[PDB]
Protein backbone atom coordinates (compact mmCIF):
# COMPACT_ATOMS: atom_id res chain seq x y z
CA UNK A 1 0.00 0.00 0.00
CA UNK A 2 1.42 3.31 -1.20
CA UNK A 3 -0.33 6.68 -0.79
CA UNK A 4 1.30 9.93 -2.00
CA UNK A 5 5.01 9.02 -2.38
CA UNK A 6 7.09 11.76 -4.05
CA UNK A 7 10.41 11.26 -5.88
CA UNK A 8 11.87 14.56 -7.15
CA UNK A 9 15.38 15.26 -8.43
CA UNK A 10 16.83 18.56 -9.61
CA UNK B 1 -1.69 -0.98 -4.23
CA UNK B 2 -0.33 2.34 -5.46
CA UNK B 3 -2.18 5.66 -5.17
CA UNK B 4 -0.61 8.93 -6.41
CA UNK B 5 3.13 8.12 -6.68
CA UNK B 6 5.18 10.88 -8.35
CA UNK B 7 8.56 10.43 -10.09
CA UNK B 8 9.96 13.74 -11.40
CA UNK B 9 13.47 14.51 -12.62
CA UNK B 10 14.86 17.83 -13.82
CA UNK C 1 -3.19 -1.86 -8.68
CA UNK C 2 -1.88 1.50 -9.88
CA UNK C 3 -3.78 4.79 -9.54
CA UNK C 4 -2.26 8.10 -10.74
CA UNK C 5 1.49 7.34 -11.03
CA UNK C 6 3.49 10.16 -12.67
CA UNK C 7 6.88 9.79 -14.42
CA UNK C 8 8.22 13.13 -15.69
CA UNK C 9 11.72 13.97 -16.90
CA UNK C 10 13.06 17.32 -18.07
CA UNK D 1 1.59 0.98 4.32
CA UNK D 2 3.08 4.24 3.07
CA UNK D 3 1.33 7.63 3.29
CA UNK D 4 3.04 10.83 2.03
CA UNK D 5 6.75 9.88 1.82
CA UNK D 6 8.91 12.54 0.13
CA UNK D 7 12.29 11.96 -1.56
CA UNK D 8 13.82 15.20 -2.90
CA UNK D 9 17.37 15.83 -4.08
CA UNK D 10 18.89 19.09 -5.31
CA UNK E 1 3.27 1.97 8.60
CA UNK E 2 4.83 5.20 7.33
CA UNK E 3 3.16 8.62 7.57
CA UNK E 4 4.92 11.79 6.31
CA UNK E 5 8.60 10.76 6.07
CA UNK E 6 10.81 13.38 4.37
CA UNK E 7 14.17 12.73 2.66
CA UNK E 8 15.76 15.94 1.32
CA UNK E 9 19.32 16.50 0.11
CA UNK E 10 20.90 19.72 -1.13
CA UNK F 1 43.02 32.51 -38.83
CA UNK F 2 42.56 28.74 -38.43
CA UNK F 3 40.46 29.41 -35.31
CA UNK F 4 37.32 27.77 -33.97
CA UNK F 5 34.20 28.92 -32.15
CA UNK F 6 32.61 27.94 -28.83
CA UNK F 7 32.26 24.21 -29.16
CA UNK F 8 29.71 22.17 -27.14
CA UNK F 9 29.15 18.39 -26.75
CA UNK F 10 25.86 18.07 -24.84
CA UNK F 11 24.37 14.66 -24.11
CA UNK F 12 21.02 14.98 -22.31
CA UNK F 13 18.97 11.70 -22.17
CA UNK F 14 15.43 11.86 -20.67
CA UNK F 15 14.36 8.23 -19.99
CA UNK F 16 11.13 6.96 -18.32
CA UNK F 17 11.49 3.27 -17.33
CA UNK F 18 8.59 1.37 -15.76
CA UNK F 19 8.48 -2.40 -15.20
CA UNK F 20 5.21 -4.09 -14.13
CA UNK F 21 5.61 -7.65 -12.89
CA UNK F 22 2.67 -9.71 -11.62
CA UNK F 23 2.03 -13.40 -10.93
CA UNK F 24 -1.39 -14.31 -9.52
CA UNK F 25 -2.99 -17.67 -8.79
CA UNK G 1 45.27 32.36 -34.72
CA UNK G 2 44.74 28.61 -34.28
CA UNK G 3 42.66 29.35 -31.17
CA UNK G 4 39.49 27.77 -29.81
CA UNK G 5 36.40 28.99 -28.00
CA UNK G 6 34.79 28.07 -24.68
CA UNK G 7 34.36 24.35 -24.97
CA UNK G 8 31.78 22.37 -22.93
CA UNK G 9 31.14 18.61 -22.51
CA UNK G 10 27.85 18.36 -20.60
CA UNK G 11 26.30 14.99 -19.85
CA UNK G 12 22.95 15.39 -18.04
CA UNK G 13 20.85 12.15 -17.87
CA UNK G 14 17.30 12.38 -16.37
CA UNK G 15 16.17 8.79 -15.67
CA UNK G 16 12.92 7.59 -13.99
CA UNK G 17 13.21 3.90 -12.97
CA UNK G 18 10.27 2.07 -11.39
CA UNK G 19 10.09 -1.69 -10.79
CA UNK G 20 6.80 -3.31 -9.70
CA UNK G 21 7.12 -6.87 -8.44
CA UNK G 22 4.15 -8.87 -7.16
CA UNK G 23 3.44 -12.54 -6.43
CA UNK G 24 0.00 -13.36 -5.01
CA UNK G 25 -1.66 -16.69 -4.25
CA UNK H 1 47.51 32.29 -30.53
CA UNK H 2 46.91 28.56 -30.07
CA UNK H 3 44.84 29.35 -26.96
CA UNK H 4 41.63 27.84 -25.60
CA UNK H 5 38.56 29.13 -23.81
CA UNK H 6 36.93 28.26 -20.48
CA UNK H 7 36.44 24.54 -20.75
CA UNK H 8 33.81 22.63 -18.70
CA UNK H 9 33.11 18.88 -18.25
CA UNK H 10 29.81 18.71 -16.35
CA UNK H 11 28.20 15.37 -15.57
CA UNK H 12 24.86 15.85 -13.78
CA UNK H 13 22.69 12.64 -13.59
CA UNK H 14 19.15 12.95 -12.10
CA UNK H 15 17.95 9.38 -11.37
CA UNK H 16 14.68 8.26 -9.69
CA UNK H 17 14.90 4.57 -8.64
CA UNK H 18 11.93 2.80 -7.05
CA UNK H 19 11.68 -0.95 -6.43
CA UNK H 20 8.35 -2.50 -5.34
CA UNK H 21 8.61 -6.06 -4.05
CA UNK H 22 5.60 -7.99 -2.75
CA UNK H 23 4.82 -11.64 -2.00
CA UNK H 24 1.37 -12.40 -0.59
CA UNK H 25 -0.36 -15.69 0.19
CA UNK I 1 49.77 32.13 -26.33
CA UNK I 2 49.10 28.41 -25.83
CA UNK I 3 47.03 29.27 -22.74
CA UNK I 4 43.79 27.84 -21.38
CA UNK I 5 40.73 29.20 -19.62
CA UNK I 6 39.08 28.40 -16.28
CA UNK I 7 38.52 24.68 -16.51
CA UNK I 8 35.85 22.84 -14.45
CA UNK I 9 35.09 19.11 -13.97
CA UNK I 10 31.78 19.01 -12.08
CA UNK I 11 30.10 15.71 -11.27
CA UNK I 12 26.76 16.26 -9.50
CA UNK I 13 24.54 13.10 -9.28
CA UNK I 14 21.00 13.48 -7.81
CA UNK I 15 19.74 9.94 -7.05
CA UNK I 16 16.44 8.89 -5.37
CA UNK I 17 16.59 5.21 -4.28
CA UNK I 18 13.58 3.51 -2.68
CA UNK I 19 13.27 -0.22 -2.01
CA UNK I 20 9.91 -1.71 -0.92
CA UNK I 21 10.11 -5.25 0.41
CA UNK I 22 7.06 -7.12 1.71
CA UNK I 23 6.22 -10.75 2.50
CA UNK I 24 2.75 -11.43 3.91
CA UNK I 25 0.96 -14.69 4.72
CA UNK J 1 54.97 24.69 -29.49
CA UNK J 2 52.70 21.85 -28.27
CA UNK J 3 49.19 22.37 -26.67
CA UNK J 4 47.48 19.00 -25.99
CA UNK J 5 44.16 20.93 -25.99
CA UNK J 6 41.06 19.61 -24.15
CA UNK J 7 39.89 15.96 -24.03
CA UNK J 8 36.56 15.39 -22.23
CA UNK J 9 34.94 11.95 -21.90
CA UNK J 10 31.67 11.22 -20.04
CA UNK J 11 30.42 7.64 -19.39
CA UNK J 12 26.91 7.50 -17.85
CA UNK J 13 25.37 3.96 -18.40
CA UNK J 14 21.65 3.53 -17.52
CA UNK J 15 21.31 -0.24 -17.07
CA UNK J 16 17.79 -1.00 -15.79
CA UNK J 17 17.56 -4.81 -15.77
CA UNK J 18 14.40 -6.08 -14.06
CA UNK J 19 13.38 -9.71 -13.64
CA UNK J 20 10.65 -11.82 -11.93
CA UNK J 21 11.52 -15.57 -12.31
CA UNK J 22 11.44 -18.88 -10.38
CA UNK J 23 7.88 -18.51 -8.92
CA UNK J 24 6.45 -22.01 -8.27
CA UNK J 25 2.79 -21.88 -7.11
CA UNK J 26 1.97 -25.54 -6.33
CA UNK K 1 52.85 24.97 -33.77
CA UNK K 2 50.64 22.08 -32.57
CA UNK K 3 47.12 22.52 -30.96
CA UNK K 4 45.48 19.11 -30.30
CA UNK K 5 42.13 20.98 -30.27
CA UNK K 6 39.06 19.58 -28.43
CA UNK K 7 37.96 15.91 -28.33
CA UNK K 8 34.64 15.26 -26.54
CA UNK K 9 33.09 11.79 -26.22
CA UNK K 10 29.84 10.98 -24.36
CA UNK K 11 28.67 7.37 -23.74
CA UNK K 12 25.16 7.16 -22.19
CA UNK K 13 23.69 3.59 -22.76
CA UNK K 14 19.98 3.08 -21.87
CA UNK K 15 19.71 -0.69 -21.45
CA UNK K 16 16.22 -1.53 -20.16
CA UNK K 17 16.06 -5.35 -20.18
CA UNK K 18 12.93 -6.69 -18.47
CA UNK K 19 11.97 -10.35 -18.07
CA UNK K 20 9.29 -12.52 -16.38
CA UNK K 21 10.24 -16.25 -16.79
CA UNK K 22 10.23 -19.58 -14.89
CA UNK K 23 6.67 -19.29 -13.41
CA UNK K 24 5.30 -22.82 -12.79
CA UNK K 25 1.65 -22.76 -11.61
CA UNK K 26 0.90 -26.45 -10.86
CA UNK L 1 52.06 32.01 -22.09
CA UNK L 2 51.32 28.30 -21.58
CA UNK L 3 49.27 29.22 -18.50
CA UNK L 4 46.00 27.85 -17.13
CA UNK L 5 42.97 29.29 -15.37
CA UNK L 6 41.30 28.53 -12.04
CA UNK L 7 40.66 24.83 -12.25
CA UNK L 8 37.96 23.05 -10.19
CA UNK L 9 37.12 19.33 -9.69
CA UNK L 10 33.80 19.32 -7.80
CA UNK L 11 32.06 16.05 -6.98
CA UNK L 12 28.73 16.68 -5.21
CA UNK L 13 26.45 13.56 -4.99
CA UNK L 14 22.92 14.03 -3.52
CA UNK L 15 21.58 10.51 -2.74
CA UNK L 16 18.26 9.54 -1.06
CA UNK L 17 18.34 5.86 0.04
CA UNK L 18 15.29 4.23 1.64
CA UNK L 19 14.90 0.50 2.32
CA UNK L 20 11.51 -0.91 3.42
CA UNK L 21 11.63 -4.45 4.77
CA UNK L 22 8.54 -6.25 6.07
CA UNK L 23 7.63 -9.86 6.88
CA UNK L 24 4.14 -10.46 8.28
CA UNK L 25 2.29 -13.68 9.11
CA UNK M 1 57.07 24.46 -25.16
CA UNK M 2 54.75 21.67 -23.93
CA UNK M 3 51.24 22.27 -22.35
CA UNK M 4 49.47 18.94 -21.65
CA UNK M 5 46.19 20.92 -21.68
CA UNK M 6 43.05 19.66 -19.84
CA UNK M 7 41.82 16.04 -19.69
CA UNK M 8 38.47 15.54 -17.91
CA UNK M 9 36.80 12.14 -17.54
CA UNK M 10 33.50 11.47 -15.69
CA UNK M 11 32.20 7.92 -15.02
CA UNK M 12 28.67 7.86 -13.50
CA UNK M 13 27.08 4.33 -14.01
CA UNK M 14 23.35 3.98 -13.15
CA UNK M 15 22.94 0.22 -12.66
CA UNK M 16 19.41 -0.47 -11.39
CA UNK M 17 19.12 -4.28 -11.33
CA UNK M 18 15.93 -5.47 -9.63
CA UNK M 19 14.84 -9.09 -9.17
CA UNK M 20 12.07 -11.13 -7.46
CA UNK M 21 12.89 -14.89 -7.78
CA UNK M 22 12.74 -18.18 -5.82
CA UNK M 23 9.18 -17.75 -4.38
CA UNK M 24 7.69 -21.21 -3.70
CA UNK M 25 4.03 -21.01 -2.56
CA UNK M 26 3.14 -24.65 -1.75
CA UNK N 1 59.14 24.22 -20.92
CA UNK N 2 56.78 21.48 -19.66
CA UNK N 3 53.27 22.15 -18.10
CA UNK N 4 51.45 18.85 -17.37
CA UNK N 5 48.19 20.89 -17.43
CA UNK N 6 45.03 19.70 -15.59
CA UNK N 7 43.74 16.10 -15.41
CA UNK N 8 40.38 15.68 -13.63
CA UNK N 9 38.65 12.30 -13.24
CA UNK N 10 35.34 11.71 -11.39
CA UNK N 11 33.97 8.19 -10.68
CA UNK N 12 30.44 8.20 -9.17
CA UNK N 13 28.80 4.69 -9.66
CA UNK N 14 25.05 4.41 -8.80
CA UNK N 15 24.58 0.67 -8.28
CA UNK N 16 21.04 0.05 -7.01
CA UNK N 17 20.68 -3.75 -6.92
CA UNK N 18 17.47 -4.88 -5.21
CA UNK N 19 16.32 -8.47 -4.72
CA UNK N 20 13.51 -10.45 -3.00
CA UNK N 21 14.27 -14.23 -3.29
CA UNK N 22 14.06 -17.50 -1.30
CA UNK N 23 10.51 -16.99 0.13
CA UNK N 24 8.95 -20.42 0.84
CA UNK N 25 5.29 -20.15 1.96
CA UNK N 26 4.34 -23.76 2.81
CA UNK O 1 61.16 23.95 -16.73
CA UNK O 2 58.74 21.26 -15.46
CA UNK O 3 55.26 22.01 -13.88
CA UNK O 4 53.37 18.75 -13.14
CA UNK O 5 50.16 20.86 -13.18
CA UNK O 6 46.99 19.74 -11.32
CA UNK O 7 45.62 16.17 -11.13
CA UNK O 8 42.26 15.82 -9.33
CA UNK O 9 40.46 12.48 -8.93
CA UNK O 10 37.15 11.96 -7.06
CA UNK O 11 35.71 8.47 -6.35
CA UNK O 12 32.19 8.56 -4.81
CA UNK O 13 30.46 5.09 -5.29
CA UNK O 14 26.72 4.89 -4.41
CA UNK O 15 26.17 1.16 -3.88
CA UNK O 16 22.62 0.61 -2.59
CA UNK O 17 22.18 -3.18 -2.51
CA UNK O 18 18.95 -4.24 -0.78
CA UNK O 19 17.73 -7.80 -0.28
CA UNK O 20 14.89 -9.72 1.46
CA UNK O 21 15.56 -13.52 1.16
CA UNK O 22 15.30 -16.78 3.15
CA UNK O 23 11.76 -16.19 4.60
CA UNK O 24 10.14 -19.59 5.32
CA UNK O 25 6.49 -19.24 6.47
CA UNK O 26 5.47 -22.83 7.32
CA UNK P 1 56.51 6.83 -34.97
CA UNK P 2 55.24 10.38 -34.44
CA UNK P 3 51.78 9.42 -33.15
CA UNK P 4 50.38 12.81 -32.12
CA UNK P 5 46.84 13.00 -30.80
CA UNK P 6 44.55 12.51 -27.81
CA UNK P 7 43.11 9.06 -27.11
CA UNK P 8 39.72 9.27 -25.37
CA UNK P 9 37.95 5.91 -25.59
CA UNK P 10 34.69 4.69 -24.03
CA UNK P 11 34.26 0.91 -23.77
CA UNK P 12 30.79 -0.14 -22.52
CA UNK P 13 30.03 -3.68 -23.93
CA UNK P 14 26.53 -4.80 -22.74
CA UNK P 15 25.64 -8.49 -22.29
CA UNK P 16 22.16 -9.13 -20.85
CA UNK P 17 21.25 -12.85 -20.48
CA UNK P 18 17.88 -13.84 -18.94
CA UNK P 19 17.57 -17.58 -19.64
CA UNK P 20 16.36 -21.05 -18.52
CA UNK P 21 19.25 -23.56 -18.40
CA UNK P 22 18.38 -27.19 -17.52
CA UNK P 23 14.87 -26.57 -16.17
CA UNK P 24 12.22 -29.26 -15.67
CA UNK P 25 8.91 -27.44 -15.18
CA UNK P 26 6.24 -29.97 -14.15
CA UNK Q 1 58.31 6.49 -30.52
CA UNK Q 2 57.10 10.08 -30.02
CA UNK Q 3 53.63 9.19 -28.72
CA UNK Q 4 52.29 12.61 -27.73
CA UNK Q 5 48.74 12.87 -26.41
CA UNK Q 6 46.44 12.44 -23.42
CA UNK Q 7 44.94 9.02 -22.70
CA UNK Q 8 41.55 9.31 -20.97
CA UNK Q 9 39.72 5.97 -21.17
CA UNK Q 10 36.44 4.83 -19.61
CA UNK Q 11 35.94 1.06 -19.33
CA UNK Q 12 32.44 0.08 -18.08
CA UNK Q 13 31.62 -3.46 -19.46
CA UNK Q 14 28.11 -4.50 -18.27
CA UNK Q 15 27.15 -8.18 -17.80
CA UNK Q 16 23.65 -8.74 -16.36
CA UNK Q 17 22.67 -12.44 -15.98
CA UNK Q 18 19.28 -13.36 -14.43
CA UNK Q 19 18.90 -17.10 -15.11
CA UNK Q 20 17.63 -20.53 -13.97
CA UNK Q 21 20.47 -23.10 -13.82
CA UNK Q 22 19.53 -26.70 -12.92
CA UNK Q 23 16.04 -26.01 -11.58
CA UNK Q 24 13.34 -28.66 -11.07
CA UNK Q 25 10.05 -26.77 -10.60
CA UNK Q 26 7.33 -29.24 -9.56
CA UNK R 1 60.07 6.15 -26.15
CA UNK R 2 58.93 9.76 -25.68
CA UNK R 3 55.44 8.94 -24.38
CA UNK R 4 54.16 12.39 -23.41
CA UNK R 5 50.62 12.73 -22.09
CA UNK R 6 48.30 12.36 -19.11
CA UNK R 7 46.74 8.98 -18.36
CA UNK R 8 43.36 9.34 -16.64
CA UNK R 9 41.47 6.04 -16.81
CA UNK R 10 38.16 4.96 -15.25
CA UNK R 11 37.59 1.21 -14.94
CA UNK R 12 34.08 0.30 -13.69
CA UNK R 13 33.20 -3.23 -15.04
CA UNK R 14 29.66 -4.20 -13.85
CA UNK R 15 28.64 -7.86 -13.35
CA UNK R 16 25.13 -8.35 -11.91
CA UNK R 17 24.09 -12.03 -11.50
CA UNK R 18 20.67 -12.87 -9.95
CA UNK R 19 20.23 -16.61 -10.60
CA UNK R 20 18.89 -20.01 -9.44
CA UNK R 21 21.69 -22.63 -9.27
CA UNK R 22 20.68 -26.21 -8.34
CA UNK R 23 17.20 -25.45 -7.01
CA UNK R 24 14.45 -28.04 -6.48
CA UNK R 25 11.21 -26.09 -6.03
CA UNK R 26 8.44 -28.50 -4.97
CA UNK S 1 61.88 5.85 -21.66
CA UNK S 2 60.80 9.48 -21.24
CA UNK S 3 57.29 8.75 -19.96
CA UNK S 4 56.07 12.23 -19.04
CA UNK S 5 52.53 12.65 -17.75
CA UNK S 6 50.19 12.36 -14.77
CA UNK S 7 48.56 9.01 -14.00
CA UNK S 8 45.17 9.46 -12.30
CA UNK S 9 43.23 6.19 -12.44
CA UNK S 10 39.89 5.19 -10.90
CA UNK S 11 39.25 1.45 -10.54
CA UNK S 12 35.72 0.62 -9.30
CA UNK S 13 34.78 -2.91 -10.61
CA UNK S 14 31.22 -3.80 -9.44
CA UNK S 15 30.13 -7.43 -8.89
CA UNK S 16 26.60 -7.84 -7.47
CA UNK S 17 25.49 -11.49 -7.02
CA UNK S 18 22.05 -12.26 -5.48
CA UNK S 19 21.55 -16.00 -6.09
CA UNK S 20 20.14 -19.36 -4.89
CA UNK S 21 22.89 -22.02 -4.67
CA UNK S 22 21.81 -25.57 -3.71
CA UNK S 23 18.33 -24.73 -2.41
CA UNK S 24 15.54 -27.26 -1.86
CA UNK S 25 12.32 -25.25 -1.46
CA UNK S 26 9.51 -27.60 -0.39
CA UNK T 1 63.60 5.49 -17.32
CA UNK T 2 62.59 9.15 -16.94
CA UNK T 3 59.06 8.49 -15.65
CA UNK T 4 57.90 12.00 -14.77
CA UNK T 5 54.37 12.50 -13.50
CA UNK T 6 52.02 12.29 -10.52
CA UNK T 7 50.33 8.98 -9.71
CA UNK T 8 46.95 9.50 -8.02
CA UNK T 9 44.95 6.26 -8.12
CA UNK T 10 41.59 5.35 -6.57
CA UNK T 11 40.89 1.62 -6.16
CA UNK T 12 37.34 0.86 -4.92
CA UNK T 13 36.34 -2.67 -6.19
CA UNK T 14 32.77 -3.48 -5.01
CA UNK T 15 31.61 -7.09 -4.42
CA UNK T 16 28.08 -7.42 -3.00
CA UNK T 17 26.90 -11.04 -2.51
CA UNK T 18 23.45 -11.73 -0.96
CA UNK T 19 22.88 -15.47 -1.52
CA UNK T 20 21.42 -18.79 -0.29
CA UNK T 21 24.12 -21.50 -0.03
CA UNK T 22 22.98 -25.01 0.97
CA UNK T 23 19.52 -24.09 2.26
CA UNK T 24 16.68 -26.57 2.83
CA UNK T 25 13.50 -24.50 3.21
CA UNK T 26 10.64 -26.79 4.30
CA UNK U 1 41.45 -1.96 -28.76
CA UNK U 2 39.05 -4.84 -28.06
CA UNK U 3 35.41 -4.26 -27.09
CA UNK U 4 33.17 -7.12 -26.01
CA UNK U 5 32.37 -9.39 -23.05
CA UNK U 6 33.60 -13.00 -23.50
CA UNK U 7 30.53 -14.62 -21.87
CA UNK U 8 29.69 -18.36 -21.63
CA UNK U 9 26.32 -18.66 -19.79
CA UNK U 10 25.11 -22.25 -19.50
CA UNK V 1 43.07 -1.99 -24.35
CA UNK V 2 40.63 -4.82 -23.63
CA UNK V 3 37.00 -4.18 -22.67
CA UNK V 4 34.71 -6.99 -21.57
CA UNK V 5 33.86 -9.22 -18.59
CA UNK V 6 35.03 -12.85 -19.01
CA UNK V 7 31.93 -14.40 -17.36
CA UNK V 8 31.02 -18.13 -17.10
CA UNK V 9 27.65 -18.34 -15.27
CA UNK V 10 26.38 -21.91 -14.94
CA UNK W 1 44.73 -1.99 -19.86
CA UNK W 2 42.23 -4.77 -19.12
CA UNK W 3 38.60 -4.04 -18.23
CA UNK W 4 36.24 -6.79 -17.11
CA UNK W 5 35.31 -8.94 -14.10
CA UNK W 6 36.44 -12.60 -14.42
CA UNK W 7 33.28 -14.06 -12.79
CA UNK W 8 32.31 -17.77 -12.45
CA UNK W 9 28.90 -17.89 -10.67
CA UNK W 10 27.57 -21.44 -10.29
CA UNK X 1 46.28 -1.96 -15.34
CA UNK X 2 43.75 -4.70 -14.60
CA UNK X 3 40.11 -3.94 -13.76
CA UNK X 4 37.72 -6.65 -12.63
CA UNK X 5 36.73 -8.76 -9.60
CA UNK X 6 37.82 -12.42 -9.87
CA UNK X 7 34.63 -13.84 -8.26
CA UNK X 8 33.63 -17.54 -7.90
CA UNK X 9 30.20 -17.61 -6.15
CA UNK X 10 28.83 -21.13 -5.75
CA UNK Y 1 47.94 -1.91 -10.96
CA UNK Y 2 45.33 -4.59 -10.19
CA UNK Y 3 41.73 -3.72 -9.31
CA UNK Y 4 39.28 -6.37 -8.16
CA UNK Y 5 38.27 -8.46 -5.13
CA UNK Y 6 39.25 -12.16 -5.42
CA UNK Y 7 36.05 -13.49 -3.78
CA UNK Y 8 34.94 -17.16 -3.42
CA UNK Y 9 31.53 -17.14 -1.63
CA UNK Y 10 30.07 -20.63 -1.22
Residue numbers in the entry:
A (entry chain K), B (entry chain P), C (entry chain U), D (entry chain F), E (entry chain A): 317 to 326
F (entry chain V), G (entry chain Q), H (entry chain L), I (entry chain G), L (entry chain B): 299 to 323
J (entry chain R), K (entry chain W), M (entry chain M), N (entry chain H), O (entry chain C), P (entry chain X), ...: 299 to 324
U (entry chain Y), V (entry chain T), W (entry chain O), X (entry chain J), Y (entry chain E): 300 to 309
Give sentences copied directly from the paper behind this entry.
Nucleoporins rich in phenylalanine/glycine (FG) residues form the permeability barrier within the nuclear pore complex and are implicated in several pathological cellular processes, including oncogenic fusion condensates. The human nucleoporin Nup98 plays an important role in multiple physiological and pathological processes. The N-terminal 384 residues of human Nup98 (named Nup98FG) comprise two prion-like domains connected by an approximately 50-residue-long linker.
To understand the mechanistic basis of the impact of the F319S mutation on the self-association and aggregation of Nup98FG, we aggregated a 30-residue peptide, which comprises residues 298-327 of Nup98FG, into amyloid fibrils. Each layer of the amyloid fibril of Nup98FG(298-327) is formed by five peptides in extended ß-structure-like conformation. One is generated by the 300FSFG303 motif, which forms a four-phenylalanine patch (purple). The second one comprises the 317GLFG320 motif, which contains the mutated F319, and is flanked by two additional hydrophobic residues (methionine and valine). In contrast, the tight zipper-like arrangement of the FG-repeats in the Nup98FG(298-327) fibrils facilitates hydrophobic patch formation with higher stability per residue.
